[PDB]
Each structure stands twice: as structure tokens, then as C-alpha cells.
Design a binder for this molecule. Structure first.
Ligand code: 4NC
Ligand code: 4NC
Ligand code: 4NC
Ligand code: 4NC
Ligand code: 4NC
Ligand code: CL
Ligand code: CL
Ligand code: CL
Ligand code: CL
Ligand code: CL
Ligand code: FE
Ligand code: FE
Ligand code: FE
Ligand code: FE
Lengths: 238, 200, 238, 200, 238, 200, 200
């Protein structure tokens, strides 16, 4: 079973988006009004699930083939790859990376999405994989289209892919969104802008990666992820 | 001062989180293996319980698109981190609120006691992380149990909450669902009876 | 019939791409090696077709509906609009604007395009319209995907829409390509880069136009076009 | 000096130009009205002729994806600019090379004479604009006719070409195609026998 | 009757003052705490009153003569003029422009103003007019004095004239305030500073306009107004 | 991206707004023609109704200096923009809360049904813009009618309000004032029972 | 976009390249082990062949200071990278043009067929890199064999050359040199009959 043997750098909650960011309208009623209560790290917070023994299907990481209903999905074929490291620069191997997204036209395969753009019969929209022994992951997918949404009267999410990363503990677990280099919708999005610091915003923007592309086949984007730095305990209870 | 690499900033899971993390609920087919809300095979050691709850926003309305991750010790107070659908018990699970009733459920065993880093026993608890549309960074909480009042009174984590009244927000109420032992743990994100949320 | 009554500003052939731009490989054998021969403007060059009486179909300008085989095309719904003016700033009304493009995945509906990305059964890829009395045109379409092509070993056209504009004479007629604000493929394309001056390149980049979008429906891009300035003759044959 | 707004820069028409401008050839269905290679209804005044040609690159190989626009006076030397498929004659047309033989064809009448701006008659000519993959900005030329030698010798535009040998590149050769009067106008983009291209 | 034939560019509610601006104390209890609900534009929102046949008195635009009790008001004689345009730069002709202000001493003719500076027996403080066919309006008045008010313990409104403009629809209708070039009270006012962007504050500052002055008579100030851009509908319900 | 001229930013109407826009209320003489609270002369077609309401701040205290502008279809569901005090009906009117009691009144006819841009019928409504001291940019709302329950349930605008409970804040209450049909429409700017406000 | 470390830029090998890479040719003593022009000892499996060629510049004049590197499969279509002068066969070799006659020679076996990355068979080929004074970055080409006409016609690499005429520049000519099977492979760097050069 799991052991308490490490500590994780405290989050900077001014680097992360705050809870109350009223331009993102749903945040108004879904943000606490009391301060968070700080607690010391114990075994409860410094351990978490490892997914080495989860059974992955052959195409779990490949959205071009994992919803195959007779053809390929329509849209810009892309590899999304990168490395998961902690804040000390240490690779985070064998960690679970999940992603989900709309199709090429900004339509989600979810019963609650009634956007008028059509679904793609060969695109599902979910992927998962474990980072390799060096902290690298990779998915193959279609670049998602912008998605309009009922926030302001004319609000549009930039092209984005949702990411969840487990890391070594429940303290490191993170959900975020990947955006694409140069997308002019990024500065306009109230969800992007829930992040106050533009340099923090920059950390969510995947870069075109021609070095990783398959010529005559698919382009590639690089998106690296940094989880809380992990260190050994020292001088505790003495 | 020493400045490390900055952590990747959080973003909301969004309303369609189910597509990625709760496939059935999104209306989609599931893969051969899914990480979900049954932590214990019927065989597993310990007292088998059902957990259930609803999640409320600042206006007292149901948050029908919440997504929850849980982490708890087994009945012997051990964290089972090697996740495997063949395990008698998994310390980790996921659940989500139904869109109609806004209720999540989790099938588990009551966790045994573990000590904090100073060696002081904590009361039996389930660690919870709450994700949803409108939640920019997930909210951490703990579910404790109302039939563990002696332990809860001594918990070195509950005692970090300055006001006794706020400690009550974390105590799940033992009840019965279809005749089986259960605990209800409602979460109030904002306003009266606001659930204590943690930073660590 | 047509009359000779105007003159058109001489082209700047260092602003336009030159003929020989060897990074664009096919240009090497398809560029003249002799100088162009300059000739004065006569009726032959200062007149040209007017398409006011061409019969346009109801959906000629609307690529979302003009290849309807049972559904909508998959991809980012966009209006492409703008104004055609000459170099003096005068609007160019009732002028023919034609456009064509790949689908959302960078596949052309042309028998010579064997790129592996699938065709979209509801997307054709051609549009046409006349500018209105104020020089404005508009199309509705899907944003095209990048298209790989056999130039260098890993070359990819940016997302682009081909444009042809007639204007008032054969001297003004132009074929060009529209690119999209912020696309990181633009600086890398040998066809874009056939244009030596980066400020000239900038003139081909359509800007996101949120003011022109249909909320919950389609985004919009603005692309204005400048044809050679037209002036009256003066002091000729005297 | 005075600097106007800069003209939008040209780009190649690309190899799939047919999708937009030559629909049938791309392999696609056509719209009710298309601008194409029949300038004259059988009725039209003047001598009805067929024009045809092939286009060569610097290596002497066929440019099989060329797209051509033409502009010419009618038989009475008038430019018909009001384009209409119901017209007896259109001064404007479009054509493209077949991918197999690399040959374009145009059905027209021989143009009558027009004067240049100084009032000097030009020899009968068709104005041509050539577009293709690898051609960054279209190439302007003129097709004149080999049975108009007296007029061609006096043409104030042909005479702007300094070398007599280069003037020959612009003179189409009268021949017969299926027994009908025709003129062949081959274009050589580069190298030996390079066709004169104009700037104006 | 009125017709739905146009759409109005969506407001930038970070350009406008937000609702909650606590230094302006009365806004604390008079700002909604729930998000505004976005709704698509219909004939309800895109139409509005036309006042071309409202009957204006001879001196309705002239505050020097519209409260005549046997003399001229005391104070700095000024013409206040400008143009109403939309965001596209289109003039807004025949639109209702209403204005109100304190006298030369900062005293309002309203029973609830008990400031100790006297009323002026020949000054009322209200005007109205329609923009002319090219979008221009003009008032003649006295420059208002700064007005102390119970906000902070030493708070004073800069000299200001209140403005209301109808525009083409209820969606364009606006109330605002004009301030005067160089007034050093402007940066100190928590009502001015309800506007977060100092470039937006600058749009409320009328400029001394010597070109429009009557020598030996009255000075003039220029105050142009921009209403929401109006455009035609396009590609709706198709 | 394309950036247009910025809109002139809004500012509060202030406490003395009546002097410019509700002359009587200021304690001031009126001009010959005023835009006021009578949208219908007694001869107008449709059901004649008195409307009235009070306006509350976030502490539940009356907002006694409110100014309201209204825009509504005639009984036949048509908007009449040609404002003229001679008309039997005007679609536009203005009113204000008395400083003493805090109550505004309008005299109008019940509006007929109007279709949205997609052709779907909206329930009978009056568009309201609310201005006051402390309100930096005016608040948009709609007044619907409690005796139109079937149409309210189907209104495409009402149905954009996510929580059914909030929809209730826009339903005016039918009563009788001195034998005549009336509807009360109270607005709560903030807090418990906060009125829904729109952006468009 | 992602930018990696830039590659060290190429420079000409220069006229005296032989002193570093073809020691005999420089007029210089050799070391114990040299990488040279004999890829096959007489005992190697496969058909033993002499290869030879001359190299011409754009004026048709011999390039007498050329240095060539070759890489080829053994007779069984396998690449042998463990370079060792003891081996019966090495897949790598080097040669150079004599300053006097301008002719290079290789002694090797005909390579067997190798599949491309898509599994399609390529026609028997030797990969060549050509270096010299005046060549700033080496030129890649392939030597195929005129007695493999059926396989050449089907080669996925040959078929990437757009003009059939240019494909001919890569077909070596079978002859006999002193009773032994030989193939001549001339390279024309520039102009008429220019050899196809690859980028990969
Ligand atoms: O309401 N949200 O949070 C949203 C709406 C649409 C999205 O695509 C998203 O990622 C989040
Ligand atoms: O070869 N070209 O010129 C090309 C190839 C692909 C394209 O999409 C294009 O516009 C031009
Ligand atoms: O923000 N302010 O306070 C400002 C902005 C612009 C001005 O010209 C000014 O006088 C004050
Ligand atoms: O409280 N306010 O809003 C005020 C007070 C005085 C003023 O002159 C004003 O324009 C607004
Ligand atoms: O002609 N070259 O290339 C030369 C001549 C001399 C050199 O030392 C050299 O490296 C190259
Ligand atoms: Cl796969
Ligand atoms: Cl609820
Ligand atoms: Cl249409
Ligand atoms: Cl050929
Ligand atoms: Cl006027
Ligand atoms: Fe999303
Ligand atoms: Fe293209
Ligand atoms: Fe005021
Ligand atoms: Fe050297």
C-alpha cells in the first residue's frame, strides 16, 4: 500500500485562476465565499492512485481510430504530445493523462450540447494514456473547432482540448485546458481570462511542433505540463 | 528567492466533462475498463456502505454537472494505490451527479483510521475533489461520519477548522437507501451552510 | 461596348511575389527568364468583363449549402467578408469575387488531390458573388485545414482560401490567397514567402471579426482587397 | 513621394484552380451558369475559328494544369464587356489544359482591329492571362494571327518588342482541326522560344 | 410599424463601468449580484422610438434663454456641440439628445439638492434637441460648477453635463456624462473612475473648440458620441 | 482582430435625473410636450391596464430616485416607433418612483404577441430599462403577465433563464386598482428574489 | 513554434578532400585500415559487379575532384551497418574521380530489393552522396539498374519524380569491362540531362 514519504510545493493560488471570476458567469454562484482552510500534508494528501495496471485499449490514445464507424474523422489531423514534469524539472513517469474535446466544428458528443454544427460520425472525442518512463505522452486527434456558449451574448471558446493529469498524489492531480498557438480567440475568452497573469495563460498554449509531424499525414502540437514539485520530508517531528 | 517552474494553471472541467471522465453519463459507449464509483467488490474486507449526495450553488440550486473524485483508506486503514479493476478494493474512485436528480453515489467500505504526519490518528474520512462548470480550480473537502463522533472530536484535521459550526458541514449523515447502510454527504459550495474546503 | 477612358496605376512587381522564388520548387521551371516587355495601356488592357448579368444561383456564395448531400459540412462555420477598393480608396462595386478551398481537414475535392484526409460529403469548396454597390462581398463557409504538399519533405500550406477578383479591367484582375490571423504555418510557407516584403504578406491575412459573427452560429473573418488605382486620362496626344 | 494604398499581392492559383474556375475539369458538377471557352454562338457575326495550344515549362514539359483567361474584340472591333451567356458574342472567356494531352481550346471569332490610345491600329489580337501552379503572378501575352502579316508588321505593340525573333513567339499558326479553321498558339514559359510576356 | 432588420454590436461591459464599483458608495447596494442573462436580439431589442415628430420649443436647446426670468444666467457662456455616430462611423441622424446640469455654482434646480451655493433665477439646467441629418447636435448653456456630494468625506463631481441619447433602438439607448478638458477633479472622482480603462474615461472628455466659438460672446466645447455599431442581418435561420 | 470605434461609456444618471427626464418630479415646470407614462389614450385598441411597482436595493430598502423607460408592442403585437403625443398609442414611455412612497405607474394596453428572430412566439412583454443613482449602466429587464401562464411557459426568452425559480421574478401580478385591471411589478436589484436582468 | 538546436551548417569539402578521406588520391601514404571502394570480397554472396562513372559540371566539363560515398543493401536486401574490413560484405564504401581521366570505380554486389516505410518494394538501388569543390552541401542521388526495368517502373521512389524523362537520369547502363558485368553511372550536376538529386 501507499506511504507518506514526500511533500509537495504549496500551490500559488494567484497563479491558478481564483474561484470568483465574474466575467465567467457560472463562477459567481459556484465559488466559495469562505476562505479555504489550510491543512498540513498527511498520507491522505501525499498519496494517490497509480494507473500502471489499468487496461488500456489499443486505440485509447488515438481519436482518429477510437470511434471508428466506417471512416476517418473530418478535420485537421494532429499529434498532441509533450512531457509531464514536476516543478523541480523531474519527469513524472507512468502517470495518467486524459483528454477530451469537441469535433472539428466545435460540436461535443454530449447529450447536453445542442450547438447547430453537426456531429462527425467517426469522431468520439475522448483519449487517455500513461506517460512513458521518461514522462512523455502522445495522442492523435483532430484539431477541435471554436465552440460558442451562453456566457456573454457573443462568446466563443478558442479551439481547446481538456486535460486531466493524475500525477503522484491527489495533491498533484490537475484538470486544465490546452489552447493553440496564435489563436486570436484566446485573449477574448472569460475562461482563459479567469487566469489573471498573462504569463500563466502562456503556459496553456501548445506550440506548433513541425519536428514531430508526419509529412503528408498529420501536423503536431507540443504541450508540456508541470505538476507540483515533489520533495523528500526533512526535519519533521524533531 | 528561489523560484521553481510554475505549475500549469487549472481551468474549469466544463459542462461536458463526462465525455472524458464519465462516458456513460455523457450518453456515450464505455471502454472495456473505466475508473468509476464501485470501490469495493462484494468480497472486500470491512463494512460495505453506500455514499450519496447532492451539490448546491450559492442560490440553493442543484449543480447537476458535478464530477467528483474520491480517495480513501481501506477498512484496515491502508491506502490501495495500485489501481486495478480486479482488486477487491480500490482506494480511488470517480462519480458524477445525475442530470435529473443531481445525485451522485459511490459504493465503498467505511475507511479505517490513519495517522497524520505527527502520528496523531485522524477520524475515518474520505478525501473528495469536486469539479464542475464554473469551478475554475477543483475544491478539496473531506467526508467524515456522524457515527464516529468520539474520533471526529479528536481529529487533528477537523480541529484546524476554527469554528465548531463549520466542522458540522463535513459530517455525513448515516441513513438507509433501499434498506442498506448509507451516508449522505451534501455539499454547499457557497452561502449558508457552506462546506469547508481545504488547501494543502 | 467598352471604352478606353481610364488608366491604372503601374504594378509594383517587387511588392507582388517575383516569378522566380526557388523555395517554391515549381516556380523554377515556370518563371520566364526574359524580362517582361512594358506596353502602354490601350482599350485592350483598360477594359474587361463586367459580370452584372451573370446568373448566380441562390447558394453560390454559401459553401454550407451549395454542396448539400443530406447534411451540413463538418468544420468551423465562418463568414468571410470584406470590401474591394482600388488604391485610391474607391469602392469597386458589382465586381466578381470567386473563392475556392479545401475542406476542414485540408482535402480538396479535385481528382488530383490524393491526400489521405477524407472528403466531406457535404462540402464542395467553391463560392462566387458580386460586390454590392458599396464594394462589399460575403461568403459563408467552413474554415479550411492545412494541406501538406510535395515541395520540401515536410511542407504544409497554412489554412487558406483562394480568391480571384475581376475588377474594372483585365489590368486589375487578380488571383491571390487569404490566410488566417495568427496561423503559425504562415511564416513557414514557401508560397507565402514568394512575397519578399513582410508588410505585403500582412495584407493577405484575414482578421477575426467578432462584430460580424452570428452568436451561437458562426464566426467571421474580414478580408479587404485592394485593386490597382483607376484614374481618368489626362493630357494625352497633346 | 505620393504613395497610394498598396495593391493586394498576387499568389499562385495552385494546382486545384479548377475547383473554383473550371469545375468540370476538377471532376465536379457545374452550376447553371459557367464562364467558359465558347465565346461565340453559331449565329455571331464574323469568321468563326477554333484556338488551341499547349503550354511548356523550362524543361520542355507540358504544363498540364494551366488556366487561361482571354479578352478580345468582336468581329467589328468592339469589346463586349456586358458578360452574358445569352449574348451572341462574349469578349471574355476561360479555358484550361486537359490533364492527359495538356491542350486548351477556345471557340471564338477572329477579332476586328482596334486602335491604341494614340489612334494607331493594332493588328488583330487576343489578350491572354496565364495562371498555374508555380506561377506566382499571372503572365500576360497576346495571340496574333499568321495570316495577318501586313497588320502585324505595323502593330505598334508588336513593334515594342526589340528583337524581331521574339515577335514570332506571338504569332499563332493557322491550321485545321477536324476540317475547320483553327490557329495554334503554343506558349513557352521559359528557355528557347520563350513567349513574350507583357507588363502594363 | 418598426421592423427587425438590423443587429447591434455586443457591448463591451469591461469598457463601460461595471455595476459594482464600491468607491462610488451607492453602487454597492444597487448592483446585481447575479450574472446578466444574455439573450439574442429580436424586434423587441432592435427597434426603438423615433422622435422626429416630438414637438420641440423654440429654446429647448438653449439654456441661456429657456429659463428666462428677466435676465441672462450668470456664468461661462458655452456652446456644446458634436456628432453622434455608431461604431462603424455612421452618423446617427434625427436622434434625441437630452442634457441636464447644475448652474455655474454647482447647484441643481431639484428640490433634493440642498447645496449651499445659490440657485440662479435665470437658469433651469435642462435641454433637448435632435441630431440633424448629418448626425450633429448643438446646445448653448453655462459651464456647470463642480458639485460636492455625500460619498467620501471630501468628494466633488468635476464640472459635468448629463447626457441621454436614444439612437436607432432601445439596444443603443445610452445615458452618460460629459466632462471638460483639463479639469483636475476628473482623476479624483469615483463616478468617473467607475470606468476602469483610462482610455474610456478619455472618451467622455469634451475638448475646447475655439473654431466653434462666437468671438466676444461664447466659447465652445466639442463632445462626440459613439453608439453601438448597427449592421444588417446575414445568414440567419439558414 | 477587427476593432471598431469604442462605444461611449455609460455613467450613472445620478439623483437629479428628473430635472432632465421627468420634469414634474424634480419640482420643475414642464415644457409643451413631454415623454411620459401614458402610452395609451382611452381610445386605443386593446385591454387597458395600469402598471405599477416599487424598486428595492440589496438591503430591501426602497429606491426612491429610479427612472424607468419602457418599450412595448401595441395590442396587435406591432411596435410603433413614430413617437407623437397625438397618437392613440405610443410604444415608448417613461416613469419614475415618487420620492415619498417609491411607487411608479404606467398607463398602457396589454401588448400582443411578438415573434423572435427564429419565428418563435414570445409571451406578451414590456421591455424595461432601469436607471438611478448608484446604477452605472442601466439594467434591462422584461415584465410578463401572470395571466399568460401558457405563453410564459413557452417563451423562448424566459426559457433562456436556467433556473425556473428566477423566471418568476419577471411575472407581474394581476390585481384591481379602483375597479380597473392592474399588474404590480416590483424589481429587486440585488439579493433575495433578485430580478433577472438581460444583456443583448 | 518548437525550435530545436540548429544543425551545424554544411560547407564544401574543398579540392583537397582526398587528404582526409581518400589518402592514395592525395599523393599520400595510407593508414592500416581505410574506408574505400571495395564493398565485396570475391567470396560475397550475390552478383559481383563493377560500377563506374564520370561527373560533369554545368558546362559539360569533367569534375575531377569529386568524392563519393555509397550505401547499399547486400544481395539479400539487408543493410549491413557493422563496418569491418574483415567482412565479406560492407554496405558502405567511398570512391573518388581520378584527376587524369575523371572516372570513379566501385567493386560491389547487386543489392537486393528493400521495402519502403509503407511496405512497398523499391527497385534495386545504391544510395550516393556526392561531395566536391563548389558543392556547398552534398548532393543525394540513387543509382538504379537498366536490367531491372520491371522493378524500376514500380519503384515508389522513382515514381516521386514528376517527369518520366528525369527518371532516366538515375538508370545505370549495363556493359562488360574485361569480361565482367559492369554498369556506368554518369552524374550531370547541372543543365542538360541534369541528374535528379533528393532531399530527405
Ligand atoms: O461553461 N463552460 O464552462 C464551458 C462551456 C463550453 C466549453 O467548451 C467549455 O470548455 C466550458
Ligand atoms: O503547388 N501548389 O502551388 C499548391 C499546392 C497546394 C495548395 O493548397 C496550393 O494552394 C498550391
Ligand atoms: O482617467 N482619468 O482620470 C483621465 C483620463 C484622461 C484624461 O484626459 C483625464 O483628464 C483624466
Ligand atoms: O450620487 N450620484 O450619483 C451623484 C451625485 C451628484 C451628481 O452631480 C451626480 O451626477 C451623481
Ligand atoms: O575552392 N575551394 O573550395 C577551396 C579552396 C581552398 C580551401 O582551403 C578550401 O577549403 C576550399
Ligand atoms: Cl492507434
Ligand atoms: Cl435545484
Ligand atoms: Cl445561402
Ligand atoms: Cl511533357
Ligand atoms: Cl437636418
Ligand atoms: Fe470545452
Ligand atoms: Fe490551395
Ligand atoms: Fe450631476
Ligand atoms: Fe581547406
Amino acid at each position: 500500500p501507499a506511504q507518506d514519504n514526500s511533500r509537495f510545493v504549496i500551490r500559488d493560488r494567484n497563479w491558478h485562476p481564483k474561484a470568483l471570476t465574474p466575467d465567467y458567469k457560472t463562477s459567481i454562484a459556484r465559488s466559495p465565499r469562505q476562505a479555504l482552510v489550510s491543512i498540513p500534508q498527511s498520507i491522505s494528501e501525499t498519496t494517490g492512485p497509480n494507473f500502471s495496471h489499468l487496461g488500456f485499449g489499443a486505440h485509447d490514445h488515438d481519436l482518429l481510430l477510437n470511434f471508428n464507424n466506417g471512416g476517418l474523422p473530418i478535420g485537421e489531423r494532429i499529434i498532441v504530445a509533450g512531457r509531464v514534469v514536476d516543478q523541480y524539472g523531474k519527469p513524472v513517469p507512468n502517470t495518467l493523462v486524459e483528454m477530451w474535446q469537441a469535433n472539428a466544428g466545435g460540436r461535443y458528443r454530449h447529450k447536453n450540447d445542442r450547438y447547430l454544427a453537426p456531429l462527425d460520425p467517426n469522431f468520439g472525442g475522448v483519449g487517455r494514456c500513461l506517460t512513458d518512463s521518461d514522462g512523455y505522452y502522445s495522442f492523435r486527434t483532430i484539431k477541435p473547432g471554436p465552440h460558442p456558449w451562453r456566457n456573454g451574448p457573443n462568446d466563443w471558446r478558442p479551439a481547446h482540448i481538456h486535460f486531466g493529469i493524475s500525477g503522484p498524489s491527489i495533491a498533484t492531480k490537475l484538470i486544465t485546458q490546452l489552447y493553440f498557438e496564435g489563436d486570436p480567440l484566446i485573449p477574448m475568452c472569460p475562461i482563459v481570462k479567469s487566469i489573471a497573469n498573462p504569463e500563466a495563460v502562456q503556459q496553456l498554449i501548445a506550440k506548433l511542433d513541425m519536428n514531430n509531424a508526419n509529412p503528408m499525414d498529420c501536423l503536431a502540437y507540443r504541450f508540456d505540463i508541470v505538476l507540483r514539485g515533489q520533495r523528500k520530508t526533512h526535519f519533521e517531528n524533531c | 528567492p528561489i523560484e521553481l517552474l510554475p505549475e500549469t494553471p487549472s481551468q474549469t472541467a466544463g459542462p461536458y466533462v463526462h465525455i472524458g471522465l464519465a462516458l456513460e453519463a455523457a450518453g456515450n459507449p464505455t471502454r472495456d475498463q473505466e475508473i468509476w464509483n464501485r470501490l469495493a467488490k462484494p468480497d472486500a474486507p470491512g463494512e460495505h456502505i453506500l455514499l450519496l449526495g447532492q451539490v448546491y450553488d450559492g442560490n440553493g440550486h442543484l449543480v447537476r454537472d458535478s464530477f467528483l473524485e474520491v480517495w480513501q483508506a481501506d477498512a484496515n486503514g491502508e491506502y490501495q494505490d495500485a489501481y486495478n479493476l480486479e482488486n477487491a478494493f480500490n482506494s480511488f474512485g470517480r462519480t458524477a451527479t445525475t442530470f435529473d436528480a443531481g445525485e451522485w453515489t459511490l459504493h465503498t467500505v467505511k475507511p479505517g483510521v490513519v495517522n497524520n504526519a505527527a502520528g496523531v490518528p485522524m477520524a475515518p474520512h474520505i478525501n473528495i475533489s469536486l469539479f464542475a462548470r464554473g469551478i475554475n480550480i477543483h475544491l478539496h473537502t473531506r467526508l467524515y461520519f456522524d457515527d464516529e463522533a468520539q474520533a471526529n472530536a479528536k481529529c487533528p484535521v477537523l480541529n484546524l477548522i476554527e469554528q465548531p459550526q463549520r466542522r458540522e458541514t463535513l459530517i455525513a449523515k448515516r441513513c438507509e437507501v433501499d434498506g442498506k447502510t448509507a451516508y449522505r454527504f451534501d455539499i454547499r459550495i457557497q452561502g449558508e451552510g457552506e462546506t469547508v474546503f481545504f488547501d494543502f
